[PDB]
RNA sequence: AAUUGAAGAGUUUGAUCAUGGCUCAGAUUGAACGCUGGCGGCAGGCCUAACACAUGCAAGUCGAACGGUAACAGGAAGAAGCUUGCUUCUUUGCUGACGAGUGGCGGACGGGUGAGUAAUGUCUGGGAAACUGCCUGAUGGAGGGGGAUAACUACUGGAAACGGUAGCUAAUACCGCAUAACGUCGCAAGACCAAAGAGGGGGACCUUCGGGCCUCUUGCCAUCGGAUGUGCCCAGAUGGGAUUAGCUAGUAGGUGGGGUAACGGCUCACCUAGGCGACGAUCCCUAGCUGGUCUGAGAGGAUGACCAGCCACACUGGAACUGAGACACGGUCCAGACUCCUACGGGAGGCAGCAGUGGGGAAUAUUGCACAAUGGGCGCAAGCCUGAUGCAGCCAUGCCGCGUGUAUGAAGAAGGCCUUCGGGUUGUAAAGUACUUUCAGCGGGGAGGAAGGGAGUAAAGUUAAUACCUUUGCUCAUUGACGUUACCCGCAGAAGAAGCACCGGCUAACUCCGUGCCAGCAGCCGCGGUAAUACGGAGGGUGCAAGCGUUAAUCGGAAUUACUGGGCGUAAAGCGCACGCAGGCGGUUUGUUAAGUCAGAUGUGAAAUCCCCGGGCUCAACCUGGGAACUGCAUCUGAUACUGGCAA
RNA sequence: GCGGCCCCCUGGACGAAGACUGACGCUCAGGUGCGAAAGCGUGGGGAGCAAACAGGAUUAGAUACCCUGGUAGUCCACGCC
RNA sequence: CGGCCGCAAGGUUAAAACUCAAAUGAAUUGACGGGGGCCCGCACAAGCGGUGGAGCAUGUGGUUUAAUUCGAUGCAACGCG
RNA sequence: GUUCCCGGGCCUUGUACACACCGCCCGUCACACCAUGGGAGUGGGUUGCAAAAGAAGUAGGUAGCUUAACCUUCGGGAGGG
RNA sequence: AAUAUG
RNA sequence: CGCGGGGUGGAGCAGCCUGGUAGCUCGUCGGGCUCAUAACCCGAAGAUCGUCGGUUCAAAUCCGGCCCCCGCAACCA
RNA sequence: GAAGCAGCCAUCAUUUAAAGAAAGCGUAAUAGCUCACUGGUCGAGUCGGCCUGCGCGGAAGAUGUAACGGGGCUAAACCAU
RNA sequence: CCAAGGCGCUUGAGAGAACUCGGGUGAAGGAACUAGGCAAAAUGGUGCCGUAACUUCGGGAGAAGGCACGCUGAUAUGUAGG
RNA sequence: CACGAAUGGCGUAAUGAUGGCCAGGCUGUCUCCACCCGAGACUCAGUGAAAUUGAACUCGCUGUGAAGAUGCAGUGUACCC
RNA sequence: ACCUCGAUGUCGGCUCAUCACAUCCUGGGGCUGAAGUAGGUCCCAAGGGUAUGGCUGUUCGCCAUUUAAAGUGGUACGCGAGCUGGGUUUAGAACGUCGUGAGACAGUUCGGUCCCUAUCUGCCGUGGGCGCUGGAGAACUGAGGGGGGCUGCUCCUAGUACGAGAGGACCGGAGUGGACGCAUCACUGGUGUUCGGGUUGUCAUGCCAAUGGCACUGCCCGGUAGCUAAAUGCGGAAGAGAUA
């Protein structure tokens, strides 16, 4: 990074730009889904498959998941497998049949809840 | 005057003897870093980016080759204001001169650098078909004419650099003709090629009274010579690599033409088909070399800055001119990279010259003084120029000299340190007393490097000329950059001036305290896990000194690539075995040749330098006389045992 | 490296006496030939044995030692290494 | 790595970086060997009586506790000091 | 009784052992680190071979254009640029 | 027979 | 609402025409062997015969239920 | 430039007609300028809800008025008779 | 491109517009088009020189990439050869 | 997810109207299309088809509608050819 | 599951549009945690404008570098009697997977015909008849209807307002480009097979000479007029009226 100079000014604005630019960038987590588990079914694939029916909101394919009853977190994931009817599928929207299995998950409990959450970027300006 | 020269130790094991590596004590350096540093002498001091550069300086010189007044210094005449006899101001090359300019010579030398360059180069020894400025000896000419042109004037384009148009004007510039062998070309007869004058002074004849003309000095020209300088050619020697084995079309040779100062595939045309190659061609990597330096007992190895010889290069790349000599470090042209200035149209530059700066890197210096001296360029000399050179500045970088006191001094002071707490030590050291004052500090004096050159005189030589000039004597004025010189004399008062490494074994020199396998030391083998002679600190001790130590670097030690001077049964090492070409070596007898070899002699082997014997710098280092060495090589003359050749 | 028997072709060393040639020698980088066992190419042959591989034992484990089978190979021709 | 040979497996020619101070030879003494000979002891053999199970005594380890004083632990400690 | 076991003595033999088999010592794997070979390729430098290109300068040739010294018949030739 | 590690 | 065979201690096991003190392996906890450890050896803990009614002196041994695992059917979000 | 209104706390009372240690603009902060509360003045209706009748807004779409059939209507509507 | 020989395709005649068909050409840029360089374009002969990785050693190969090329005269009243 | 060693694996020169990709050349393929020359398309003369067709004096808009109206309703617009 | 299976040919692209406003940009305003500025948000506003490329079956999307700005939707997811046929419902073949298999896959890869002369309506241009009250010729009024309606950058106002400084205006003026449309050949260019020249091969004109024919206009170089865009002139307004 090579600069030969106009004013101190803008030298003090491309500094603190650089330092905004290598700041660290995310903080918003917010849900896009929540989904309600019923009737549990076993696959070499992942271990065990969870029925779904999504309660509320959209399902997509790639996303943090957090696996709940009643204020625990009973599992912990990345969304793994979103299966529809007999196919997988990029996404899902709510009152809709799915399915769900995450790699070494064969811990279901029928109505626990399966909360997608989406995860957003901000950028922070030094000032 | 000359052969006095060679050391080993530590470390593999429980212990030993071998083999064998690793490591150290040595010497040395264009050194750096670390810590510390008083003065002096001498020597030496960018080895990195052939990277780029601000500003200043680095060769010009002759009016005695020439027009000239652009200088400006006088003089005169004249024109004028008067100071009234002188000042003043326009002319004037009259005159001491002298910018720009013309012409000649110098700019091709010296200085700096090590990029490229493995031989085309370099070194040594030989050679033939060559030229060679200036500079000297010899023999003779130096006759008679002519045309331009810059400068300079009048116009005119330009920001600047730098010019344009038209006339005028000289010359030791330029060009014809005459004149010409002993010269060039030819068998000869013959043909043809040169010139330049300038300067000083002077009786006679005379002069368009400018000088003609005489006489002296010098320059011009041709030729045969000198010494010098350079080009050319051949042999041998002169880095590394075979995991580079094939390489060469102008290549190799011939003839003829052309070309160079000259031999020449030097270059063409044509003809022939060779050349080089295991004694390492070719290619690649790498490098300036030698006389020498350094090391080494020697043999050897490493190294080639300093110093000198030679070569090569000069922003990158190429070519030619001028000239005696360049394919030109501060010349030219063109092309390229790149840098700058600008009015933007168009122009400018090559610090590896000396200083000096950026950058680089561990790291190598003052934008000094002077032509006083030596040696150069030009000139007849004066003179002028000389960043060559002579000197100084800076740096403990190296070498070397010297000082930082001397003598006395026991109560063996206190303190410090140890201490079986008896004492011991630090330590005659200190303290004290008696002395000396180098070198510094300060005030005074003063060699040599200066011989010459200049000016004036005289003689002698010269000449038609007591001239006039040179030579050779004499005499008088002078000529020091460094320079507050070297060096000497006088004064005060121990005053101003000692640090650094190391102490287990190697390896000279020992205890205590702290830390406690931590922290750290280590060149090598190794030390430390609470009593560390190995760490940290102190005390003590040893080495060495204005330096000391570490590091990097090379040789040594290393007979550890072994020629001198090694091994290979089992330690690393004999191809699995054999036949065989090139290569190495060869029974025994006689003759011969004399290559190798051995002897002798001459020439050469630069000088510096090393060595041996001397001298001189206040003494050494350093400087310097003479000799030896000059270890080699070539040619020539010899010897004939041995080896080789040849003959039986 | 070659051990049944016999033949054919055919190598060399050594002795014996005697004869002849008359240094024709010794060694040899480069180069060339030969060169066990294993292995490879093609086509045959294959009684034993024996990699591989299988199974049964042993063992903590035993894909080994040990034991039972058993392929390539071991055999031959001609090539190669 | 490159060259060369070879059908390939492979062979041949043949490094450097790097790392470590030993690698290593023979020989000597000892110790050790599931090496050998020789040879002895309640070593085994041939026998007799016991411990190890039971209850108790005492010591140890360990546990526990305010303290369970401290040391001793293969033979060569545990009715030990 | 001395075959077997433990322990011990003598001789002889083997040895990479000498804090003496309770010795010593091999290689994978896991781990960290260091260098190095290969590597689709990428980026430079150098350079052979074969062509294009052709400034400037020299060398060679010039029915043009232009021109002071020589020749001349005074027109021009010769010569130069 | 058979027996591993410090 | 679907075809097969099994259920004995912590885990895995023998009892089949032969219904007569539930014992044997692997783990677990102790003891022995060794200088010490693995290894090895001797031992101890360990139960309604899955669960029920019948069977019946005593039970996979003889039945039917409940229930569980495996067998294949066995989906396969 | 804080004394009610930039802050933090007290989350109360006094003086008092009436004034809450005060709600805002304002002031550099008080003041200024008012509110809450009341006096003077003037002059009779005044203030907030509730239940029902009828409206207003909430009301953005796709070829052209394009959600009274149209013109057009405040009765030619709506409600009751 | 012509000879011998044989033919002028059984509707014509006028306009000279979109647009379609068969063709020629083009500034500047040169695959930007598009599923896709499809289609057009460009290369194209002989002789000589020269020619890589890689390879079953034949190849690769015409590799790649270049140079010469008309006409007239002379060598030769038209030579070498037939 | 869900290769595989004769339903062959993996290498492979030469080869291919093969598949994918990229480079250079080259261009109206295109940014961005223009012009012209030929044959139709047009007028005239002659000859002369074909698919198709419930019947028709065969308008737009909005809405309705066996749910996307030339014919309906409402409305607008429209010389005849 | 109401229209359509005695046929409404299915995704995307290209060419070609059109409307809606829930407005991407340009306009006008309020509030702003609105210093300037850059913004944020909401309302009103549908005239005009509203990116090329890389990637791919490609919508979408990712990514590029731009721009006043790269709108969201409707229209048989506008548009195949206009075009493409890569994707996608044909027949080949293959791979994986599944099935004993024939075969299948809503997994994939390579290959693989887009028909039709426009009657009517509709739509774009240009005519004939008749009417308009005697007939005829000319020039107009303008009822009515369409096209046009874009925006960057520079300078001044002003380095002012505003602001600590940096930075950096409103409003109102003056130029000069892009985009796009209309006009038009003087210029620069293009074409220019009816104008000229060169040139290869061959035939004919008796022959040589000089021409002519033919070979893509044989090949090829130039170029008049006309027509042309890549050439060069111009345009978008100001203002008024009535209002959100």
């Known amino acids: 990074d090579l600069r030969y100079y106009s004013v101190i000014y803008n030298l003090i604005d491309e500094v603190k730009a ?10 918003k987590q917010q849900i896009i889904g929540l989904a309600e588990v019923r009737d549990v079914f076993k696959s070499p694939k992942f ?46 929207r709510n009152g809709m049949e799915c399915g769900i299995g995450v790699k070494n998950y064969n811990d279901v409990r029928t109505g626990d809840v399966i909360e997608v959450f989406e995860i957003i970027e901000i950028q922070r300006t030094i000032a």
């Open 18 to 27: 650089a330092m905004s630019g290598m700041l660290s960038p995310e903080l």
């Open 47 to 92: 271990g065990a498959i969870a029925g779904c029916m999504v309660t509320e909101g959209v399902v997509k394919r790639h996303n943090p998941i957090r696996v709940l009853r009643d204020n625990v977190v009973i599992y912990e994931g990345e969304l793994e497998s979103l299966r529809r009817f007999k196919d997988d599928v990029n996404e899902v």
